[PDB]
Symmetry: C2
């Protein structure tokens, strides 16, 4: 029920926030890696959408994984095999490219929650 | 450690089998939906790659979900929002389009296993 949206672009954060809210999730937002870790610690989200700075997203996921198995769905405009592979290896549970379907993304957050209880 | 590859195309099954074997997984194969359910029941795989017949894959996943939370990674040449969304809603944990990166796909099976223990 609580999603932390980590996104350095306010337009995209706003759209994901809107759509997650319409689904009935409680939404917290962060706009850089420091805020992401702070919100993760303070709010203890059930899932994180991570969309960050050219490596900060990877470090955020890395850092969270030291202490927590919270599902991380990484989002990114980078779509190469290396990018996807490295995101997952560093602890993302899923990696979705930008631009994305609002749906699917709803369906992927549901699948992740279903699988993490 | 045991993967059931459900694929009606022997060339693709062979490639996934080869690559999963190189990773150290035990591989069982099925080539239609009936075989998929039979192998699922008899072999109790730790994960299923499901790549089937225009709805049989969806029914296979549906049927398995009546009894089991085993991770299902659906694979398909169909790449539309509807296709991805419906696969996940019917119980797939992930959906990867064809053609796929042998890597990533290795990384996605690992992420799924990591998340399912």
């Amino acid at each position: 029920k609580k999603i932390l949206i980590v996104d350095d672009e306010k337009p995209i954060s706003d759209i994901i926030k809107f759509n997650m809210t319409k689904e009935g999730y409680e939404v917290v937002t962060a706009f850089n890696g420091r805020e992401a870790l702070e919100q993760f610690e303070a709010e203890q989200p059930d899932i994180i959408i991570l969309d960050l700075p050219e490596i900060d997203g990877l470090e955020v996921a890395k850092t969270i994984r030291k202490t927590s198995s919270v599902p991380i769905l990484m989002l990114s405009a980078k779509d190469s095999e290396f990018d996807k592979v490295i995101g997952l290896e560093l602890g993302a549970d899923d990696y979705v490219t930008k631009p994305f379907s609002n749906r699917e993304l709803q369906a992927r957050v549901k699948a992740l929650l279903r699988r993490s209880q």
